[PDB]
Design a protein around this ligand. Sequence first.
Ligand SMILES: Oc1ccccc1-c1ccccc1O
Length: 156
Amino acid sequence: SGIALSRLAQERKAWRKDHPFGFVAVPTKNPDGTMNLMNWECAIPGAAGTPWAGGLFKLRMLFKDDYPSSPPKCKFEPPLFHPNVYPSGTVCLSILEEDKDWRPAITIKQILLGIQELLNEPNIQDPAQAEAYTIYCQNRVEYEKRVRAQAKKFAP
Ligand SMILES: Oc1ccccc1-c1ccccc1O
């Protein structure tokens, strides 16, 4: 897709020029070694001063041929404990749905910051995995304990 690839090159240039510290976002490679702009490997650092601090949380960002009409699918690999992350790893977030709050102008940087913000502030209206959601609702102290253990597990 010429339209998607042109925009993704634009995103890559912008990201490399200016991006938040500790974040990573890079396109992958095709089997022949060439760059594959439709599939990115990213990492989001936990915010300091939060239970996510010190963790580095890896995720894949997958673009459809009609991007930026459509949002990327964003999928934590491996899956994360969080009320709004499906067991598959896929992120449940309104800016990542075409029929909700996605806008074509939204940047990869805005997506990754949006997901970082989600990590530390779950949306109770969007339960995506039963366990983390139930614990978040029932016992915030236990919830944060599980989150800190997870951050340690994924320390760089
Ligand atoms: O290992 C990484 C280091 C830095 C940034 C991304 C990754 C990654 C993200 C998703 C899937 C695989 C990966 O290797």
